[PDB]
Amino acid sequence: TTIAGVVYKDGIVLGADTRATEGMVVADKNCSKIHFISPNIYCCGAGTAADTDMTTQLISSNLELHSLSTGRLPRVVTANRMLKQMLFRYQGYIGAALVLGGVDVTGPHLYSIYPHGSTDKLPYVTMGSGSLAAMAVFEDKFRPDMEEEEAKNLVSEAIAAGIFNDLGSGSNIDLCVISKNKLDFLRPYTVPNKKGTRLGRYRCEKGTTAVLTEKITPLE
Amino acid sequence: SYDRAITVFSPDGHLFQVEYAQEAVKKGSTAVGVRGRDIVVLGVEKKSVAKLQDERTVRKICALDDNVCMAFAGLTADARIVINRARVECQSHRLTVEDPVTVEYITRYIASLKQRYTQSNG
Amino acid sequence: TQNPMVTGTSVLGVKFEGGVVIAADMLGSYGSLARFRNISRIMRVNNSTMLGASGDYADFQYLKQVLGQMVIDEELLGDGHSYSPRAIHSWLTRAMYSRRSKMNPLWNTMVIGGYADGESFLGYVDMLGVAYEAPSLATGYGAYLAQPLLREVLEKQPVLSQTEARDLVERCMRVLYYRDARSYNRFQIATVTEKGVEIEGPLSTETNWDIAHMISG
Amino acid sequence: RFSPYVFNGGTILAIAGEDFAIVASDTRLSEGFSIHTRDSPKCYKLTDKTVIGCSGFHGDCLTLTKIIEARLKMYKHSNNKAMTTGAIAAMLSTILYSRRFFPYYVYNIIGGLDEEGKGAVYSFDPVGSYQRDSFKAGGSASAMLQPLLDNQVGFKNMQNVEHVPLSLDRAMRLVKDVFISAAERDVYTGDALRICIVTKEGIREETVSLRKD
Amino acid sequence: MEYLIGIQGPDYVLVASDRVAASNIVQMKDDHDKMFKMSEKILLLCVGEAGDTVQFAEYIQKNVQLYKMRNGYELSPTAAANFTRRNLADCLRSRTPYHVNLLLAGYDEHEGPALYYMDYLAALAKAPFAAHGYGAFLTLSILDRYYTPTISRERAVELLRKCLEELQKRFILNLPTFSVRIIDKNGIHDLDNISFPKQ
Amino acid sequence: SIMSYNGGAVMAMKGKNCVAIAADRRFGIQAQMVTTDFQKIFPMGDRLYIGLAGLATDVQTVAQRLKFRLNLYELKEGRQIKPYTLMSMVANLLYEKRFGPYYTEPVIAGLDPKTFKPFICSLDLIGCPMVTDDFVVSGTCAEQMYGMCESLWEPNMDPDHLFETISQAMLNAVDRDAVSGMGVIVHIIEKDKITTRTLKARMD
Amino acid sequence: TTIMAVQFDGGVVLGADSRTTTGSYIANRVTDKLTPIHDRIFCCRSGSAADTQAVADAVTYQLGFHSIELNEPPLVHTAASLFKEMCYRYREDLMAGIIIAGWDPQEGGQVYSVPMGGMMVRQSFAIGGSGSSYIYGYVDATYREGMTKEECLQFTANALALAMERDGSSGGVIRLAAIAESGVERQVLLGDQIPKFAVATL
Amino acid sequence: TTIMAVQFDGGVVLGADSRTTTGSYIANRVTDKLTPIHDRIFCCRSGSAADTQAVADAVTYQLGFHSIELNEPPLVHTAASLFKEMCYRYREDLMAGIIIAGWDPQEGGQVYSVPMGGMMVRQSFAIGGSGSSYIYGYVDATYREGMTKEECLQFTANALALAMERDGSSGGVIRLAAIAESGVERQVLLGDQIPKFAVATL
Amino acid sequence: TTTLAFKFRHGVIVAADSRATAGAYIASQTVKKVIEINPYLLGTMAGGAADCSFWERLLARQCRIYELRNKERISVAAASKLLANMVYQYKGMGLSMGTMICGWDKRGPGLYYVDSEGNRISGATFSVGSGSVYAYGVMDRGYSYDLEVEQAYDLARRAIYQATYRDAYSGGAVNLYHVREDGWIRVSSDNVADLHEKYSG
Ligand SMILES: *[C@@](C)(CO)[C@](*)(O)[C@H](CC(C)C)NC(=O)[C@H](Cc1ccccc1)NC(=O)[C@H](CC(C)C)NC(=O)[C@H](CCc1ccccc1)NC(=O)CN1CCOCC1
Ligand SMILES: *[C@](O)([C@H](C)CO)[C@H](CC(C)C)NC(=O)[C@H](Cc1ccccc1)NC(=O)[C@H](CC(C)C)NC(=O)[C@H](CCc1ccccc1)NC(=O)CN1CCOCC1
Ligand SMILES: CC(C)C[C@H](NC(=O)[C@H](CCc1ccccc1)NC(=O)CN1CCOCC1)C(=O)N[C@@H](Cc1ccccc1)C(=O)N[C@@H](CC(C)C)[C@@H](O)[C@H](C)CO
Ligand SMILES: CC(C)C[C@H](NC(=O)[C@H](CCc1ccccc1)NC(=O)CN1CCOCC1)C(=O)N[C@@H](Cc1ccccc1)C(=O)N[C@@H](CC(C)C)[C@@H](O)[C@H](C)CO
């Protein structure tokens, strides 16, 4: 996992790769790791896939209930509290490293949440197997109050570093821009990796597969 | 749960609920049984012949095990309960003890069950 | 060595136009303790090559002794032949693998920089005898932090000037000082050109800490 | 304690034709979750007729390579002739078994031409067990490469298909294809594919490109 | 160590087991029976751990009989097999798992003869013939070599004899005698015990 | 490995307006084969199949409990189930045992009962969903299956090319694995019909 | 971590480094290790980040409800006692070294230590964290009773600087907090602001 | 244990505690840790008693023969090099932390450290032993270049006192040695002679 | 693996599969598991591939040197004893190896089983490998000393086949050799896929 998150002048940029592995084999070439929490809050997930999924879904649900009862737009601190308290209650057995980003009535907020339940509120964060590379890119080329396209470039650059330098990351770069009045969920923001084109035709023509038994069954 | 005393003593020393249950038995279809030398016979009366009803699904005679059979009189649903619990007990006896079951034993079990229901809360 | 004691962390290397540059902090750590904050982890092996070392400092001192002796031994003959950087790299590979196979490794990971016959050399050697050549090298946490930066530049511009490479190195040392808990804000830069090997004195890295005042918002 | 082994990845392939022999490999050297270098071919030219592919632990790869070189020279000095391919295979077997109780962590495939000019592959296991093949894969992505070649070169599981001998061209595109596919799934396979073709003319070296993730 | 074997014919199921109950290095019983009558047309061949076998087998048995009493008709061999498999699978990840390997033989008035195989992990699989224990490793191949779907019960018994004789030849365990029964439209029939006059 | 105890292989492929799902037929315990006709693919309704590879017991059990919940679903609601819905259902069922998981990796292949839009996904043993547009594999020979699928699969295949493709993939992947094989079964399902074939395969 | 708290007349002075590490990697070079429990009650965290954060939250909760229920400014000893109860009860499940310090209308400036055991003791000054080991001597030779607020400030600044210099698990920036009846004066020493000392040359 | 050695102009100053422990028991509350290797070459021992004693003996042997064979006052660097060779060669079998210091006609007062690794480095001053951990900060904040002999004496005295106060494995008495061209001036600080520091009260 | 060998009136029949695995992965199906030591001496091969190959090759070398030195051919007993003695010196070191030395001797047909464990026993029939039990079944159910040649071929081939059917680590192709007095002869090499068609229908 090679996710990341940054805070700029008008809001927050979230980034993530799309490689999912089992063993040392790529299982999913295109996996969405940027999750919907609330219409103003998104969260990148790294670690145990099912854990990040179910956790992010559960907290999203609880926040929907929350805002439904309050009638207001959900705060980021709330998602942070829910996440950290749940994760801490399970003492790290839920393999969920998270980058929580969102815009509030109080402004832009970015948290990093480790599976043991600890959180850090920082202007920029990275998580995943490729987090060191991305963090290097951030530490090298970050400045406070960036413009939107600048921040998008920085984050995509970080995720790219993760993609090419870490064997755990690969494929595409997904971004999510969140300002005080806009939500750009750019899915394929960049496809820096492409499968080589086939040089042959290994197409098997009808009949080459021997059959022992057949049974057709009509439907409706 | 429902912690309420249902069957209690009356000032004259009667258990009214039990007597009422006996009156409910009195309204049941007649059920007689006799014991012979090499055979034993059980017969039940007024089976409420509607001729549109399947006779099999309303029999008042039920087998508890290969050794013991049983007829009843009164509330049929309650009888279903008692009969099933009796069958289960008949099997459990085989489980805990290699030997099958005596008629006296399963009778004692049924009786104890009924009494337990005469002295339990709710 | 089965259990390393006093150790040094990352070592960086990168080729440039007509030379090679290498960096390494001057820290010897005893676990989490910054025990010896003034030691050189860079050696001048003759005039065409140079060596930076990560890992157990004592074993590095041993290799320093041995290599120094080899260079002296060769220089005594004066037969017009000398050890090329590639040769030194090959020898070091052989040695590390030999110790590895004796189940008694020299707990070191090394970067050899050099310049001979107009070509820039940069070689990596493990404690297991894993060795290779590359335009950029980073040992330890550098390999996770500095190397991604180095590759980003080298794949956008293969040839760098000496000043460019030096800048890149400085920035990488800054990143390492930021993120590596066993590093130190006091490092050395060695350089090979046709003019020879030059090791520059105690350098510091400028640090920005403005993100300290971004707790609230 | 201390482990004298580390897996450095790498995939390797050899195909034997009627008058040629292809030995190809990726160029990625990695360790753990990191890339050591993208320019590290696993192919080694032994003789004009023989090329060796070595994958696995890089230390043992280098060492075994240099050993094979030295012993080639020795044989040349001893018999005034170059080592035939099969001879190199047998020698490699003995050398590998010489460390039966401290093995080289190396998967070896030898590709070349025999004494009749025909192509030949020899596949090895880390301790010297070898056999002659028409085509074989080894290294990390081996299980991804093998099944296709079983189908396309061995014509296995195909009904009423013709047994046309593999040409150099088709073999080349097959190699490029299986490596391109392997780069998709194996995380240890990528960067570049080096291919070595061995014919009566000699040894050509081609270099296709693979993805960098 | 225990041995089970089942061979399904066109209209019958032939089952056999060893008669040895052994502990440590001694045979403690030479007439042990590994079969459990569950229906008039269903046999359960259970084998394995010490108490687990008898406990589990008897539990299943009494539950099947309970079904019969409650409903007036017996479970089909298939329903029985899936019942036992359900019970065994439920206890697999519990505090008290039953380490038992089993065969289930049966005859249905509709589906005919049936033989089932069950791992201790409760993996149920129907088969024309099966075997449990180390002896299986020596007998299954033989069953592969000579079995035909239309085999007569006489020929089936002869095949069983080939298997048991093979056990007498190669197997290091004693196993002198064997319980043999058959199941058809007329229920369970006890056959003459295949035995070998050792001593 | 627990997964390798029984072995097996399950694959699903996408087509034009059709879909395919295949699996080997061997039921074995470690190294010995017990049965050659073991069902690993179960119909969860018309034009919607699931294929479970892994520990045989958990294959059967997950299949059965899934059929339980499915039946209850199609009873409570007056409709057949959508592929996505079935996927989420399986995911939930598996994740309920997060800390004591079934050892099986399910693969769902079907057509949208309302539309006809093809659908293939796979899941963790703890129920993490993964939807693809080409193929999905699960089993002891996953690497071999990936090898074949990455080189044989084409986009818009007709119900005949899809069959040949998934069949060659399954056969040639399985033939390089010792605990997968003893026959291969393929279900090719389309809007009008379902075609079930057992391939001619090695039995060693 | 290197945490510290010194008591002067009208209140206390708190100090901490800002380095948070997982393994040898610095997951946060700028952590705020001084956590507000109440208006004039702070705590210094060391050990597991998750543990100390959770405990700090819980104690803030409890102490908030308690102070509301009493309608009085909470005693520092009370906060320290809540921390003590939590850390002692779950000593086998928590990795926490805490220094609870602050001002209180009844007892003035107070500093309490709650080390990993779960015990509690009031001290004139307290140090904790991995780096504290390297400054025991300095802090022993430099401490003088009757220090002014600014003197304590400079004191903790120097000590923390030394510890950060020596300890690899400590570093980054210096966070200071001054607590008295007046309120809370927080400040941050970074770069050249951090006290430097002569390193041996020849 | 806790050793120390500081370099001044015309020579060096050595210091050590005197506690030798096996487990938590003090097998010798009055150890002599400063061991003479040659007329003006001393070494400070820490770690295994047996190991350091054996190595010290061996080095005294070798250096004696060497100095006789050269007919010259042995270089301090040479003694340090013998210690270095022994400790590095048998690093997996020895538990020794050594500080070799002394005077030498060619290089004057010298101090070298040979920690458990087997490495060797010259330092303006050096500390070792279990107690050294507690005085890194003090020794960092107190050291000043150009110290006089008596200043170095007082320096090591104070540092050792602090370390002994904090470290349980250190204590007993303070042994000091002054080495210059003049010779060797050894002395012992005991009881009230040992520097004391203000302990926190209220 | 799944090799087997039995001696009857007309010599010594030897048979084997050809599968070679590296875990569950099938690394090869074209392995010659019957090593041709001498034109009168064969050696089956099961267990560790490299171990068997190396040690039996060395055995062949030794037998050749014996032939040159003593101006006569080595006996089956002497060859088996040689191999057993060589292997025994490495007992406990982890050599996985179980082989059969077959041939024709001055004492007629000879067959020995030799272990890496240290076993060395002469016998009529033998089956070695992961699928040895399955082979033992059919082989024992069909063996006789008075078997005619083609019958013996059928028995061996079928036994190896059934073995490959049940044993997950046995397959590929059944190879069959016949050892006669004037030397051995390579009888057959039928693939299992074909033998399936032959034996089933
Ligand atoms: C100073 C800095 C001394 O180091 C301090 O004491 C600080 C103070 C606080 C504010 C952090 N202490 C730490 O930084 C602390 C020490 C520690 C390390 C390991 C175990 C216990 C304590 N380290 C951390 O807080 C980091 C920071 C982030 C949130 C990651 N986290 C970790 O070190 C965790 C520890 C959890 C753990 C894992 C396994 C067994 C026991 C505990 N690192 C991991 O968990 C690593 N791993 C991968 C993820 O999940 C499985 C385990
Ligand atoms: C110093 O470092 C400071 C004070 C901190 O330790 C001092 C000063 C030195 C120069 C004397 N060092 C010690 O006090 C030292 C610690 C040590 C322990 C173990 C190995 C190496 C160093 N104490 C000793 O060396 C002491 C010497 C005499 C007995 C006074 N012996 C030991 O500590 C025993 C080591 C032998 C050993 C045990 C197991 C495996 C291999 C070798 N340790 C014992 O426990 C001895 N014994 C058995 C248990 O009950 C008590 C008695
Ligand atoms: C198969 C895909 C769809 C998902 C995959 N799942 C799996 O790999 C699951 C097991 C997960 C698990 C089970 C029990 C206890 C803890 C974890 N594995 C299996 O289902 C099959 N095997 C059975 C036996 O052998 C090993 C696995 C996964 O989560 N992969 C993680 C990495 C991982 C963590 C822990 C255990 C196993 C794998 C991932 O992709 N993580 C990325 C973030 C995403 C996917 C949210 C990142 O971290 C990046 C890409 C680096 O890997
Ligand atoms: C690459 C293949 C073709 C050969 C294979 N080699 C291997 O498996 C080599 C052996 C490495 C080794 C190291 C130290 C000491 C000894 C061996 N291992 C590896 O290549 C790498 N693996 C690492 C993880 O997966 C498993 C192995 C092998 O020998 N397989 C044996 C089984 C075996 C025995 C002992 C150790 C390991 C494996 C085999 O096929 N034996 C057959 C007969 C012979 C002559 C081929 C039979 O046993 C039949 C087929 C059943 O397996």
Short mmCIF file of N, CA, C and O and ligand atoms in Angstrom, two decimals, chain A residues 1-3 17-23 27-28 31-33 35 45-53 93 95 128-130 166-170, chain D residues 33, chain F residues 1-3 98 101 103-105 122-126 128-130, ligand 3:
data_model
loop_
_atom_site.label_atom_id
_atom_site.label_comp_id
_atom_site.label_asym_id
_atom_site.label_seq_id
_atom_site.Cartn_x
_atom_site.Cartn_y
_atom_site.Cartn_z
N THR A 1 0.82 -1.20 0.00
CA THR A 1 0.00 0.00 0.00
C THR A 1 0.86 1.26 0.00
O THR A 1 1.79 1.38 0.79
N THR A 2 0.54 2.19 -0.90
CA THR A 2 1.29 3.44 -1.00
C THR A 2 0.34 4.63 -1.07
O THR A 2 0.26 5.32 -2.09
N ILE A 3 -0.37 4.88 0.03
CA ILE A 3 -1.31 6.00 0.09
C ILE A 3 -0.62 7.27 0.58
O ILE A 3 0.60 7.30 0.76
N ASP A 17 -2.40 4.14 -4.46
CA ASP A 17 -2.18 3.27 -5.61
C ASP A 17 -3.35 2.30 -5.70
O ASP A 17 -4.33 2.44 -4.98
N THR A 18 -3.26 1.32 -6.60
CA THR A 18 -4.37 0.40 -6.81
C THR A 18 -3.95 -1.07 -6.86
O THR A 18 -4.68 -1.90 -7.40
N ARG A 19 -2.79 -1.38 -6.30
CA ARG A 19 -2.32 -2.76 -6.29
C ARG A 19 -2.73 -3.50 -5.02
O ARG A 19 -2.49 -3.02 -3.91
N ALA A 20 -3.36 -4.66 -5.19
CA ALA A 20 -3.68 -5.53 -4.07
C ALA A 20 -2.99 -6.88 -4.27
O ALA A 20 -3.13 -7.50 -5.33
N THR A 21 -2.26 -7.31 -3.25
CA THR A 21 -1.44 -8.52 -3.35
C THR A 21 -1.90 -9.62 -2.41
O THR A 21 -2.44 -9.35 -1.33
N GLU A 22 -1.69 -10.86 -2.82
CA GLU A 22 -1.75 -12.00 -1.92
C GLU A 22 -0.49 -12.85 -2.10
O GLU A 22 -0.28 -13.44 -3.16
N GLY A 23 0.34 -12.88 -1.08
CA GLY A 23 1.67 -13.45 -1.21
C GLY A 23 2.53 -12.44 -1.94
O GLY A 23 2.43 -11.24 -1.68
N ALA A 27 -2.90 -9.63 -7.03
CA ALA A 27 -4.23 -10.20 -7.13
C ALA A 27 -5.19 -9.22 -7.80
O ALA A 27 -6.00 -9.62 -8.63
N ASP A 28 -5.09 -7.95 -7.44
CA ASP A 28 -5.92 -6.92 -8.05
C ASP A 28 -5.04 -5.80 -8.62
O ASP A 28 -4.27 -5.17 -7.90
N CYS A 31 -7.55 -1.61 -7.60
CA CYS A 31 -8.29 -1.65 -6.35
C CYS A 31 -8.50 -0.24 -5.82
O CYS A 31 -7.55 0.53 -5.69
N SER A 32 -9.75 0.10 -5.51
CA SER A 32 -10.05 1.41 -4.96
C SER A 32 -9.74 1.45 -3.47
O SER A 32 -10.39 0.78 -2.67
N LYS A 33 -8.73 2.24 -3.10
CA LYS A 33 -8.29 2.31 -1.72
C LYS A 33 -8.68 3.63 -1.06
O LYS A 33 -8.33 3.88 0.09
N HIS A 35 -11.78 5.59 0.29
CA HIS A 35 -13.13 5.21 0.68
C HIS A 35 -14.01 6.39 1.09
O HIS A 35 -13.54 7.36 1.69
N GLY A 45 -7.22 3.54 2.70
CA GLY A 45 -6.98 2.35 3.49
C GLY A 45 -5.80 1.52 3.02
O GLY A 45 -5.69 1.18 1.84
N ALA A 46 -4.92 1.18 3.96
CA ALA A 46 -3.79 0.31 3.70
C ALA A 46 -3.71 -0.77 4.77
O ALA A 46 -4.10 -0.55 5.92
N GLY A 47 -3.21 -1.94 4.40
CA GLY A 47 -3.09 -3.03 5.35
C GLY A 47 -3.93 -4.22 4.97
O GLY A 47 -3.95 -4.63 3.80
N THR A 48 -4.63 -4.79 5.95
CA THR A 48 -5.52 -5.92 5.68
C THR A 48 -6.75 -5.39 4.97
O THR A 48 -7.51 -4.60 5.52
N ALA A 49 -6.93 -5.83 3.73
CA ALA A 49 -7.95 -5.28 2.84
C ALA A 49 -9.35 -5.33 3.44
O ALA A 49 -10.02 -4.30 3.57
N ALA A 50 -9.80 -6.53 3.81
CA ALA A 50 -11.13 -6.71 4.37
C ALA A 50 -11.34 -5.85 5.61
O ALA A 50 -12.43 -5.34 5.85
N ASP A 51 -10.28 -5.68 6.39
CA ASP A 51 -10.35 -4.86 7.60
C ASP A 51 -10.58 -3.39 7.27
O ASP A 51 -11.46 -2.76 7.84
N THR A 52 -9.79 -2.86 6.35
CA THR A 52 -9.96 -1.48 5.91
C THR A 52 -11.36 -1.26 5.34
O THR A 52 -12.02 -0.27 5.66
N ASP A 53 -11.80 -2.20 4.51
CA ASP A 53 -13.14 -2.17 3.94
C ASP A 53 -14.22 -2.08 5.02
O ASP A 53 -14.92 -1.08 5.12
N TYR A 93 -5.50 -6.04 16.24
CA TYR A 93 -5.88 -7.25 15.52
C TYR A 93 -6.66 -6.95 14.24
O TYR A 93 -6.88 -7.83 13.41
N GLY A 95 -6.10 -5.14 11.04
CA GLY A 95 -4.99 -4.60 10.27
C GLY A 95 -5.39 -3.45 9.37
O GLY A 95 -5.44 -3.59 8.15
N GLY A 128 1.40 2.77 4.46
CA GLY A 128 1.54 1.65 3.55
C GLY A 128 2.98 1.19 3.40
O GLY A 128 3.89 1.79 3.96
N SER A 129 3.17 0.11 2.65
CA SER A 129 4.50 -0.43 2.41
C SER A 129 5.39 0.55 1.64
O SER A 129 6.62 0.48 1.72
N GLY A 130 4.77 1.46 0.89
CA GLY A 130 5.51 2.44 0.13
C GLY A 130 5.46 3.83 0.75
O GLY A 130 5.67 4.83 0.07
N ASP A 166 8.44 0.63 -4.36
CA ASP A 166 7.96 -0.43 -3.49
C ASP A 166 7.31 -1.58 -4.26
O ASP A 166 6.39 -1.36 -5.05
N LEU A 167 7.78 -2.80 -4.01
CA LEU A 167 7.24 -3.98 -4.67
C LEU A 167 5.81 -4.28 -4.23
O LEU A 167 5.12 -5.09 -4.86
N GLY A 168 5.37 -3.62 -3.17
CA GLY A 168 4.03 -3.82 -2.65
C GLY A 168 3.00 -2.94 -3.33
O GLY A 168 1.80 -3.20 -3.24
N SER A 169 3.46 -1.91 -4.02
CA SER A 169 2.57 -0.99 -4.72
C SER A 169 2.77 -1.07 -6.23
O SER A 169 3.79 -1.56 -6.71
N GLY A 170 1.78 -0.59 -6.98
CA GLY A 170 1.84 -0.60 -8.42
C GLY A 170 0.59 -0.04 -9.07
O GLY A 170 -0.24 0.51 -8.40
N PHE D 33 11.07 -5.71 -0.08
CA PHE D 33 10.06 -5.00 -0.85
C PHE D 33 10.69 -3.88 -1.67
O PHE D 33 9.99 -2.98 -2.14
N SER F 1 0.37 -26.01 4.62
CA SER F 1 -0.73 -25.05 4.52
C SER F 1 -2.09 -25.73 4.63
O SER F 1 -2.28 -26.84 4.13
N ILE F 2 -3.03 -25.06 5.29
CA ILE F 2 -4.37 -25.60 5.48
C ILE F 2 -5.13 -25.68 4.15
O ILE F 2 -5.83 -26.65 3.88
N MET F 3 -4.97 -24.65 3.33
CA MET F 3 -5.62 -24.58 2.03
C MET F 3 -5.20 -25.74 1.13
O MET F 3 -5.99 -26.25 0.33
N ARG F 98 -14.07 -13.55 11.06
CA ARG F 98 -12.80 -12.85 10.86
C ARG F 98 -11.64 -13.47 11.64
O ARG F 98 -10.53 -13.59 11.13
N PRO F 101 -11.61 -17.99 10.54
CA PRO F 101 -12.15 -18.00 9.17
C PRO F 101 -12.31 -19.38 8.55
O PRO F 101 -11.56 -20.30 8.87
N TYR F 103 -11.68 -21.78 5.56
CA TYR F 103 -10.53 -21.82 4.66
C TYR F 103 -10.97 -22.12 3.23
O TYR F 103 -10.73 -23.20 2.69
N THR F 104 -11.62 -21.13 2.63
CA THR F 104 -12.07 -21.23 1.25
C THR F 104 -12.07 -19.85 0.60
O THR F 104 -12.35 -18.84 1.26
N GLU F 105 -11.75 -19.81 -0.69
CA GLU F 105 -11.71 -18.56 -1.43
C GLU F 105 -12.71 -18.60 -2.57
O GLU F 105 -12.40 -19.11 -3.65
N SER F 122 -14.08 -12.33 -6.89
CA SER F 122 -13.49 -13.32 -5.99
C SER F 122 -13.40 -12.72 -4.61
O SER F 122 -13.54 -11.50 -4.45
N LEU F 123 -13.19 -13.55 -3.59
CA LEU F 123 -13.10 -13.05 -2.22
C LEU F 123 -12.01 -13.71 -1.38
O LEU F 123 -11.55 -14.81 -1.68
N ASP F 124 -11.60 -13.01 -0.32
CA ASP F 124 -10.69 -13.55 0.69
C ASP F 124 -11.33 -14.71 1.42
O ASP F 124 -12.47 -15.09 1.14
N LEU F 125 -10.60 -15.28 2.37
CA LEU F 125 -11.20 -16.22 3.30
C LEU F 125 -11.95 -15.43 4.38
O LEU F 125 -12.82 -15.97 5.06
N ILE F 126 -11.60 -14.16 4.52
CA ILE F 126 -12.30 -13.27 5.45
C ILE F 126 -13.26 -12.34 4.73
O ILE F 126 -13.81 -11.41 5.33
N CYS F 128 -13.03 -10.36 1.59
CA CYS F 128 -12.73 -9.13 0.87
C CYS F 128 -13.02 -9.30 -0.61
O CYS F 128 -12.38 -10.12 -1.28
N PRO F 129 -13.98 -8.53 -1.13
CA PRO F 129 -14.44 -8.65 -2.52
C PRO F 129 -13.47 -8.04 -3.53
O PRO F 129 -12.78 -7.07 -3.22
N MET F 130 -13.43 -8.62 -4.72
CA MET F 130 -12.61 -8.11 -5.81
C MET F 130 -13.30 -8.41 -7.14
O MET F 130 -13.40 -9.57 -7.54
C1 LIG J 3 -6.51 -11.18 -1.85
C2 LIG J 3 -6.69 -9.74 -1.78
C3 LIG J 3 -8.04 -9.25 -2.42
C4 LIG J 3 -6.54 -9.18 -0.37
C5 LIG J 3 -5.50 -9.76 0.58
N1 LIG J 3 -5.97 -10.80 1.42
C6 LIG J 3 -5.18 -11.89 1.72
O1 LIG J 3 -4.07 -11.95 1.28
C7 LIG J 3 -5.67 -13.07 2.57
C8 LIG J 3 -5.49 -13.03 4.08
C9 LIG J 3 -5.66 -11.73 4.84
C10 LIG J 3 -5.56 -11.98 6.37
C11 LIG J 3 -6.07 -13.17 6.87
C12 LIG J 3 -6.01 -13.43 8.24
C13 LIG J 3 -5.41 -12.46 9.06
C14 LIG J 3 -4.90 -11.30 8.57
C15 LIG J 3 -4.98 -11.05 7.18
N2 LIG J 3 -4.98 -14.22 2.07
C16 LIG J 3 -5.79 -15.28 1.44
O2 LIG J 3 -7.00 -15.12 1.37
C17 LIG J 3 -5.14 -16.53 0.88
N3 LIG J 3 -4.04 -17.15 1.66
C18 LIG J 3 -4.43 -18.29 2.43
C19 LIG J 3 -3.29 -18.96 3.11
O3 LIG J 3 -2.06 -18.39 2.63
C20 LIG J 3 -1.92 -16.98 2.79
C21 LIG J 3 -3.11 -16.25 2.25
C22 LIG J 3 -4.95 -8.62 1.35
O4 LIG J 3 -5.55 -8.15 2.23
N4 LIG J 3 -3.70 -8.07 0.94
C23 LIG J 3 -3.09 -6.87 1.73
C24 LIG J 3 -1.71 -7.24 2.36
C25 LIG J 3 -1.83 -8.30 3.43
C26 LIG J 3 -1.85 -7.90 4.72
C27 LIG J 3 -1.97 -8.82 5.68
C28 LIG J 3 -2.08 -10.16 5.33
C29 LIG J 3 -2.07 -10.55 4.04
C30 LIG J 3 -1.95 -9.62 3.05
C31 LIG J 3 -3.11 -5.64 0.73
O5 LIG J 3 -3.41 -5.78 -0.38
N5 LIG J 3 -2.70 -4.35 1.30
C32 LIG J 3 -2.66 -3.15 0.51
C33 LIG J 3 -3.76 -2.25 0.89
C34 LIG J 3 -5.11 -2.52 0.34
C35 LIG J 3 -5.29 -3.83 -0.38
C36 LIG J 3 -6.23 -2.09 1.19
C37 LIG J 3 -1.35 -2.54 0.88
O6 LIG J 3 -0.74 -2.80 1.88
C38 LIG J 3 -0.28 -2.51 -0.20
C39 LIG J 3 -0.72 -2.89 -1.57
C40 LIG J 3 0.85 -3.50 0.08
O7 LIG J 3 0.54 -4.85 0.16
#
